Homo-oligomer: A and B are copies of this chain.
Amino acid sequence: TVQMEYEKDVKVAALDGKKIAVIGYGSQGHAHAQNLRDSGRDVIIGVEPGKSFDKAKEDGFDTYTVAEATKLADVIMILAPDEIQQELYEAEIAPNLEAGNAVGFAHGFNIHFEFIKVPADVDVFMCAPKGPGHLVRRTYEEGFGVPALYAVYQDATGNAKNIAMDWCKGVGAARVGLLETTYKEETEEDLFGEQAVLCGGLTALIEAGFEVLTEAGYAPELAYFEVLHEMKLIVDLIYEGGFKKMRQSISNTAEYGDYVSGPRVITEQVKENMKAVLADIQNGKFANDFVNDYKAGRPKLTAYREQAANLEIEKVGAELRKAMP
């Protein structure tokens, strides 16, 4: 069991008096740093020279290099892409850590799969808002926020959980709901969800439907609406009220078709396919494949991206979206 937690469950204001460095100033970094400052926390930014550096000083943040920001900080939150974190950590963060420091991530990939090992006299925590940077910043400004997972990988000080929860509170997530997890569970469920369902499964399902229709001789423009455009309405309904609300709102013909045909398409064998996807997440195979592709100059990602640029549903879709305000 696990109960959702809120501001009243943040027992200790553990970020009190802490010097906070956010590493990276992309959308994610910006949202965290800005939210914490508005909450009333001492935030500085650690990023390599460039546009983000300049914008960081434009926004009024004491901006330093990654190495120096880590030197100054009690709490260091690393918000950079997974594939560059190991290099960045080893070269700029690790030599500038001190005992009793705390290092945070928003996703557990590098820590869980042990591409990064933080010294054992240093806390490692996680606050993982379930939203993109701009939504994390915006909802905070509007007065609430985006819900989040929190976790602790290693607790050297005894303060790590309180730091994680206070970070969550500081970025607005505690205003709407928190769920405690582990680094292992967050990492494996997050990878599995996006691969089997949210991104991989979904786009593949859409593409397969589009192919069946267009290959059967139906017009691609019309197929676009029937497998893609109208999905927003459906998912918005599920988001708000689950399968129940969605199926109430659609016609009984559609509802009946849902019940009857859903299981013909997504079968036991498909569920087995998902189990194989989960297995390669648990055993480290996917993680190694991704890092290896990155190290090799992204050749698989390159081929995937150029292929996806040439999909008929993507060309037709671009034209149709152009033709609609």
Contacts and interface: CB of A to CB of B under 8 A. Distances in A.
A296 interface: no
A256 to B, nearest CB: 5
Interface stretch (A61-69, A91-99, A116-124, A231-239): A231-239
A208 interface: yes
A191 B236 CA distance: 20
Contact of A209 (B4, B193, B209): B193
A253 interface: yes
Contact of A254 (B194, B247, B269, B274): B194
Contact of A193 (B192, B227, B252, B293): B227
A284 interface: no
Number of copies: 2
A185 B147 contact: no
A310 B195 CA distance: 26
Interface string A83-116: 1000000000000000000000001010000000
A212 B196 contact: yes
Contacts of A206: 197, 238, 243
Nearest to A109: B253
Interface stretch (A7-15, A39-47, A130-138, A154-162): A130-138
A72 interface: no
Contacts of A256: 290, 293, 300-301, 304
Contacts of A277: 261, 264-265
Given A193-B226, A242-B321, A259-B301, A199 B286 contact: no
B189 A223 contact: yes
Per DSSP, are chain A's interface residues mostly helix, strand or loop, or mixed?
helix
A199 B238 CA distance: 10
A32 to B, nearest CB: 15
Interface stretch (A16-24, A51-59, A163-171, A214-222): A214-222
Interface residues of A, number: 121
Contacts of A181: 219, 222
Interface string A173-202: 000110101000110111111111111111
Contact of A82 (B195, B252, B294): B252
B201 A209 contact: yes
Contact of A176 (B107, B232, B325): B325
A324 B177 contact: yes
Contacts of A228: 238-239, 242
A81 B251 contact: yes
Given A2-B221, A223-B189, A208 B257 contact: no
A224 to B, nearest CB: 9
A222 B189 CA distance: 8
A295 interface: no
Question: Counting chain B CB atoms within 10 Å of each CB, which of A191, A235, A247, A301 scores highest?
Answer: A235
The 6 A-B pairs of least Cβ separation, nearest first, read A193-B226, A200-B262, A204-B266, A204-B262, A195-B261, A199-B258
Given A244-B318, A264-B277, 5 more contacts: A144-B325, A185-B218, A189-B226, A202-B235, A252-B301
